[PDB]
Amino acid sequence: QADLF
Amino acid sequence: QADLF
Amino acid sequence: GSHMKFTVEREHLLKPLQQVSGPLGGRPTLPILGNLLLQVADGTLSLTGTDLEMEMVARVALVQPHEPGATTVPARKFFDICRGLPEGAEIAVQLEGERMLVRSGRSRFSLSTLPAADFPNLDDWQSEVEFTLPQATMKRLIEATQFSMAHQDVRYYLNGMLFETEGEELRTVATDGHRLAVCSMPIGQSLPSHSVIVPRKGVIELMRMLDGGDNPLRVQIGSNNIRAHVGDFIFTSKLVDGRFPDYRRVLPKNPDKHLEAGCDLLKQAFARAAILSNEKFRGVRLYVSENQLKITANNPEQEEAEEILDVTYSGAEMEIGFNVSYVLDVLNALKCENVRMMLTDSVSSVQIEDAASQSAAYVVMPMRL
Amino acid sequence: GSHMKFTVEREHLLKPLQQVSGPLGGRPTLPILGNLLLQVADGTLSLTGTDLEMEMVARVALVQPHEPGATTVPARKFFDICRGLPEGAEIAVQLEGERMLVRSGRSRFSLSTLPAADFPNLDDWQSEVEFTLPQATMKRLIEATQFSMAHQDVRYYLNGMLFETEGEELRTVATDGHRLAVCSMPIGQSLPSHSVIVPRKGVIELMRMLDGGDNPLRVQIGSNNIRAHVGDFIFTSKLVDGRFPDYRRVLPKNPDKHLEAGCDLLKQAFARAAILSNEKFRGVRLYVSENQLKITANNPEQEEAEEILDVTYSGAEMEIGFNVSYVLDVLNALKCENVRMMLTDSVSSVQIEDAASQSAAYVVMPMRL
């Protein structure tokens, strides 16, 4: 899962 | 609590 | 057959799959117990779920073309897929190698399988005692006693419900060693004398299969199993092999004292006094005198609840202690206008009944206070 | 006063007792936080519950004779007693020594107390911004973002909800670092700019105090507190002192591709595909092509779900991975006919919103496929 910020 | 039997 | 295949409407699967996906849990004993056995033969689809102690079978008519065969698939995933498809969907199922394919519209599911030859069987017995009764009669019998069954007791046979046939009646009995419940209902048929213990989980499934419709319940009892049929569902359970206590000797003999009161006012008074009873022991004190009942509760904080009620009572004055949850469980199960209590002394059981009906009786042993 | 005494109708005491006592269940930090502070003065009964971070105050008019004073009493026990009494019951309360007596008919309860002087109070403060709005507007704002709040994240400030006032609008923002939700609503008043973080438990209490009636909600926001008034109930909460992420910089800057589809059909396709996605990672793959969306899920058992949908899309083909629970949460919160998705590429956030309204926007970061 990639970080949104 | 007493035993019923 | 090697190439199992069938096509059926979504609607015809939903009720069968919920009923058969029911005797299951999140953690099966063996991986194959988490699967449903699917069998297709001569115009019928059969769905079976089991946990080795009991089994549920549903039969679905196959009107569309199909090929015989059998497989097992993950129960909950197969159920969730079918339920998740749109209303009025058609479901086409087929075995492709070691996978079971589920297709509907442009939705495609490939499920893992385990061999049908590896699935357990709770068949291979003949019924000795057989009978039919309305669903409402079975529901009434179980609801009237189920709460008195034991919870994980060392005496395994108390973790179940006695089912007894006698004359024209079917009877249930449940007890946990402190309190007992018994209910008898006429079924309109002369029966031989038979007594079996249905396990806790079996009682739960018998209730869950009752849909409230006009389909009759057909029961078969063997030496180590019981079976119940309702429409196209068949529930089978192993019996508990043990000696159950005899309710007729547990009922108080020659009750010296008789109290009568409104069921609801008595329930609401016990429920309020329970708030200030000890959270573990739940002890309340009953003081019975001429046309009066006084209920008192105290707890480790030294808080106190007191209820005074007008009752019909003309016996000798007496004080008696009870676990308030056992009394409330009884009053909740009566759902009547007036209740009768039959007492002897402070160290002996009390019989609680509906003041109008004898179909159900409850026995609660007191506590020392 | 030394001898607090009051008599009130159960009818008038019940909803106030629920409003304040609701979140006083469980293990209080301090024994007195399990009690309600009762104050009687000049025709009013005040009932306060707190946990040190927030407080709930209800005011009940006293029509019958009373004597001033204060005490604290176990919240849940006091509520259960009043709820358990019959409809139309009159409740007479009085201090007697260190006990609080509750009487109604021939029901008598003696409760333990803790001194009112020991009851904690939130520190006084002044509102910097004040406004009113309908209850439905607050409920809509909270429901549209609450699911995106973080769950016990080490970044304490993501565990709350941002409340922002700007121009004529009130806005909420919630994010957990993977997905974000934002909703703005018109409140009909020109307001100064203010941005505060309301803690998780405060958001829960603000929702719980909305009864769906016609009573308006008055909000006051200070530097370190927020307060909401509805009828005769006042909720106050401390604010989370931290820097919340800025949603304006999190919204995708230049979405190249735009997809539109029916909300329900898209939700049901994702829900079915989720069944065969990995139970921990929940990854699904989206393949967007001309007027078509393909959703695929696979799990460690190598089971596969595939959904094909007709959608409105005319951009370049692309593959993108998502946690299916984050997508379903957005679709469940968008209670609309059609939804729009704004994509850039496979490694960049997607914006999801109602195809008809811009009041709410959702941003979900993808997962590597």
- Beta-bridged to residue C261, according to DSSP, are C339
Helix axes D263-274, C75-84, angle to 10 degrees: 170
Helix (H, G, I), strand (E, B) or coil at D325: helix
**Cβ–Cβ of A1/D365 closer than 8 Å?**
yes
Resolution in A for the shown PDB structure?
1.9
Contact C224, C194 (CB under 8 A): no
Helix axes D200-208, D135-143, angle to 10 degrees: 140
Helix axes C75-84, C11-20, angle to 10 degrees: 150
Contact D6, D40 (CB under 8 A): yes
Residue A1 corresponds to which amino acid? Q
Contact D282, D366 (CB under 8 A): no
The whole-angstrom distance between C305's CA and the closest CA on chain D is 5
Enumerate the residues of chain A whose CB falls inside 8 A of the CB of residue D364.
4
Experimental method: X-ray
C166 vs C135: CA distance, rounded Å = 19
Enumerate the residues of chain C whose CB falls inside 8 A of the CB of residue B2.
178, 347, 365-368
Enumerate the residues of chain D whose CB falls inside 8 A of the CB of residue A1.
178, 281, 323, 365, 367-368
The whole-angstrom distance between B4's CA and the closest CA on chain C is 5
Helix (H, G, I), strand (E, B) or coil at D112: strand
Q: Residue A1's closest chain D neighbor by CA?
A: D367
Helix (H, G, I), strand (E, B) or coil at C305: strand
H or E stretch at D203: helix D200-208
Whose tokens are 């049901």? That residue is D268
| CA D137 vs CA D3, D353, D355: distances in Å | 44, 18, 21
User: Chain-centre distance of CA D91, in angstroms?
Assistant: 33
SS3 content of chain D, % helix, strand, coil (to 5): 20, 45, 35
Q: What is the token pair recorded at C96?
A: 């492709």
**Cβ–Cβ of C84/D272 closer than 8 Å?**
yes
Q: What are the DSSP calls for D209-271, one per residue?
A: T--SSSPPEEEEE-SSEEEEEETTEEEEEEPB-S----HHHHS-S---EEEEEEHHHHHHHHH
Helices (H) and strands (E) in chain A, counts: 0, 0
| Closest CA relative to residue D129, chosen from D184, D160, D169 | D169
H or E stretch at C172: strand C160-175
Q: Could you tell me which residues come within 8 angstroms of residue C106 by beta carbon, excluding any fewer than 6 positions away?
A: D307, D308, D309
C193 vs C221: CA distance, rounded Å = 12
| Farthest CA pair distance, chain D | 80
Q: Provide the 10 A C-beta neighbour count for residue C187.
A: 21
Residues D81-106: b if buried by 16+ CB within 10 A, e if exposed:
bbebbeeeeebebbbeeebbbbbbee
Q: What is the token pair recorded at C215?
A: 């389909």
- D363 shares contact with chain A (CB less than 8 Å): yes
Q: DSSP letter for C24, please.
A: -
**Cβ–Cβ of A1/D367 closer than 8 Å?**
yes
**Cβ–Cβ of B1/C367 closer than 8 Å?**
yes
Contact C295, C270 (CB under 8 A): yes
Q: What are the DSSP calls for C232-293, one per residue?
A: TEEEEEEPB-S----HHHHSPSS--EEEEEEHHHHHHHHHHHHTTS-TTT-EEEEEEETTEE
D150 vs D155: CA distance, rounded Å = 9
Q: What are the DSSP calls for D123-173, one per residue?
A: PP---SEEEEE-HHHHHHHHHTTGGGS-SS-SSGGGGSEEEEEEEEEEEEE
Contact C7, C90 (CB under 8 A): yes
Residue B5 corresponds to which amino acid? F
H or E stretch at C163: strand C160-175
Residue D89 corresponds to which amino acid? A
H or E stretch at D76: helix D75-84
Dihedral pair phi/psi, residue C157, rounded to 5°: -70, -20
C232 vs C264: CA distance, rounded Å = 40
Whose tokens are 């070691």? That residue is C98
Enumerate the residues of chain C whose CB falls inside 8 A of the CB of residue D77.
275-276, 303
Whose tokens are 């941002």? That residue is D162
Contact D198, D238 (CB under 8 A): no
Contact D369, D357 (CB under 8 A): no
Q: DSSP letter for D86, please.
A: P
C328 vs C87: CA distance, rounded Å = 44
Q: What is the token pair recorded at D148?
A: 């995106």
Dihedral pair phi/psi, residue D268, rounded to 5°: -65, -35
Q: What is the token pair recorded at D296?
A: 């695929």
Choosing among D80, D106, D279, which should be mutated to test the C contact, i.e. which has the most C CBs within 10 A? D106
Q: Provide the 10 A C-beta neighbour count for residue D218.
A: 14
D8 vs C367: CA distance, rounded Å = 37
Q: DSSP letter for D79, please.
A: H
Q: DSSP letter for C318, please.
A: E
Helix axes D324-333, D263-274, angle to 10 degrees: 150
D331 vs D343: CA distance, rounded Å = 16
- Beta-bridged to residue D342, according to DSSP, are D258, D351
C140 vs C25: CA distance, rounded Å = 27
Dihedral pair phi/psi, residue D44, rounded to 5°: -135, 135
Q: Provide the 10 A C-beta neighbour count for residue D143.
A: 15
Q: Could you tell me which residues come within 8 angstroms of residue C199 by beta carbon, excluding any fewer than 6 positions away?
A: C53, C54, C159, C160, C237, C238, C239, C240
**Cβ–Cβ of A4/D365 closer than 8 Å?**
yes
Rg, Å, chain A Cα set? 4
By CB atoms closer than 10 A (0-12, 13-18, 19+), residue D122 is: middle
Contact D364, D326 (CB under 8 A): yes
Domain D5-118: CATH superfamily is DNA Polymerase III, subunit A, domain 2 (3.10.150.10)
- Beta-bridged to residue C160, according to DSSP, are C199
- Beta-bridged to residue D227, according to DSSP, are D220, D236
- C14 shares contact with chain B (CB less than 8 Å): no
C182 vs C149: CA distance, rounded Å = 11
| Closest CA relative to residue D345, chosen from D286, D300, D275, D276 | D286
**Cβ–Cβ of B4/C367 closer than 8 Å?**
no
CA dihedral C220, C221, C225, C227 (to 10 degrees): 20
Residue C290 corresponds to which amino acid? E
Contact D148, D158 (CB under 8 A): no
Q: Provide the 10 A C-beta neighbour count for residue C317.
A: 11
Q: Provide the 10 A C-beta neighbour count for residue D43.
A: 9
**Cβ–Cβ of C307/D84 closer than 8 Å?**
no
User: Chain-centre distance of CA D247, in angstroms?
Assistant: 19
C2 vs C137: CA distance, rounded Å = 44
Contact D257, D314 (CB under 8 A): no
Q: Provide the 10 A C-beta neighbour count for residue C251.
A: 15
| Closest CA relative to residue D369, chosen from D350, D352, D347 | D347
H or E stretch at C94: strand C90-96
Q: Provide the 10 A C-beta neighbour count for residue D40.
A: 22
| Closest CA relative to residue C289, chosen from C262, C259, C265 | C259
The whole-angstrom distance between C120's CA and the closest CA on chain D is 22
C99 vs C217: CA distance, rounded Å = 37
C354 vs C333: CA distance, rounded Å = 10
Q: What is the token pair recorded at C339?
A: 């209740």
| CA D255 vs CA C26, C192, D252, D360, D366: distances in Å | 43, 79, 6, 17, 14
End-to-end CA distance of chain C: give it in Å, rounded: 70
Q: Residue D87's closest chain C neighbor by CA?
A: C268
D270 vs C201: CA distance, rounded Å = 35
| CA C208 vs CA C21, C75, C147: distances in Å | 12, 18, 16
Contact D131, D167 (CB under 8 A): no
By Cβ distance, the residue of C250, C347, C368 closest to B4 is: C250
Whose tokens are 């393949």? That residue is D287
By CB atoms closer than 10 A (0-12, 13-18, 19+), residue D165 is: buried
What subunits make at least 3 CB pairs under 8 angstroms with A?
A: D
| CA D337 vs CA C230, C347, D145, D314: distances in Å | 42, 69, 19, 21
User: Chain-centre distance of CA C250, in angstroms?
Assistant: 23
Q: Residue D365's closest chain A neighbor by CA?
A: A4
Enumerate the residues of chain D whose CB falls inside 8 A of the CB of residue C77.
275-276, 303
Helices (H) and strands (E) in chain C, counts: 7, 22
Q: DSSP letter for C32, please.
A: G
End-to-end CA distance of chain A: give it in Å, rounded: 12
Contact D352, D339 (CB under 8 A): yes
The whole-angstrom distance between B1's CA and the closest CA on chain C is 4
| Closest CA relative to residue D1, chosen from D75, D95, D131 | D95
Contact C341, C259 (CB under 8 A): yes
Contact C75, C119 (CB under 8 A): no
User: Chain-centre distance of CA D210, in angstroms?
Assistant: 10
SS3 content of chain C, % helix, strand, coil (to 5): 20, 45, 35
Chain breaks in chain A (C to N over 2.5 A) after: none
| Closest CA relative to residue D301, chosen from C77, C69, C116 | C77
